From Swiss-Prot:
Annotated protein name in UniProt: IgG receptor FcRn large subunit p51
Tissues of expression: Expressed in full-term placenta, heart, lung, liver, muscle, kidney, pancreas, and both fetal and adult small intestine.
Intrachain disulfide bonds: 92-155, 194-248
Alphabetic keyword roster: Cell membrane, Disulfide bond, Endosome, Glycoprotein, IgG-binding protein, Immunoglobulin domain, Membrane, Phosphoprotein, Receptor, Signal, Transmembrane, Transmembrane helix
Domain (Ig-like C1-type): residue spans on this chain: 175-262
Keyword RNA-binding: no
GO terms (BP aspect): IgG immunoglobulin transcytosis in epithelial cells mediated by FcRn immunoglobulin receptor; immune response
Extracellular topological segments: 1-263
Keyword check for Membrane: yes
Chain positions covered by the region annotation Alpha-2: 84-173
Membrane topology note: Single-pass type I membrane protein
Similarity field: Belongs to the immunoglobulin superfamily.
Subunit structure: FcRn complex consists of two subunits: p51, and p14 which is equivalent to beta-2-microglobulin. It forms an MHC class I-like heterodimer. Interacts with albumin/ALB; this interaction regulates ALB homeostasis.
Designated gene of the protein: FCGRT
Amino acid sequence: LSLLYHLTAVSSPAPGTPAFWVSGWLGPQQYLSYNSLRGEAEPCGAWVWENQVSWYWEKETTDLRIKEKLFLEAFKALGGKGPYTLQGLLGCELGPDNTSVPTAKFALNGEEFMNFDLKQGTWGGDWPEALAISQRWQQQDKAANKELTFLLFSCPHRLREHLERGRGNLEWKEPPSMRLKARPSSPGFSVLTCSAFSFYPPELQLRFLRNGLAAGTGQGDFGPNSDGSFHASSSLTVKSGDEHHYCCIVQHAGLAQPLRVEL
């Protein structure tokens, strides 16, 4: 499970809206929230109850505050009509022999355009705006080193701290509540919806079976709940009156074993 920061900056934020905000993620689970309207990094969900080193959240805040100035600075190096969106995907994951594996990706207006080359401590890209933003970020003192320190030192340190002080939160297994409905689409044909309510982790497989034999996955739909749990539904179209030969099979870590679902 990797720790990731979702960073977003806008050049023309609507009134009462942040110009810059960050969510922090441990796997598929949000632990951090930050925006330029409040200027403070705060815990999310169960992580509010996490016993912490007392200087943790202030250090997350100061780091994100530094990123904030940098992101809003990037816009000044751009000369187009605008508006602009600068997105960043910053983070790390623990590798085999103690070491960690970094992730430094950036997108302009929803299109990937920059990365951070950890080998040489440089921002890289081929678009004129990528070179412009890279140059301005290189010009700022300590900036390249703070990106290095962020990804190689503090990130793996935060990750290890969350795995130790909040192991149970990551290991959370919750089975889905399964349902199977049948509805008539185009006359002579029926549709089956295999639904999965409130599960974690999101890793899940729905498989239809025709009279015990394979029928494959239908057309899947996936989404989150408010508590950080998940929801899915797969759909397969079947001939009328032939519904009761088909059944749904779910595979989930909350279950000890794949479970059949009937109508």
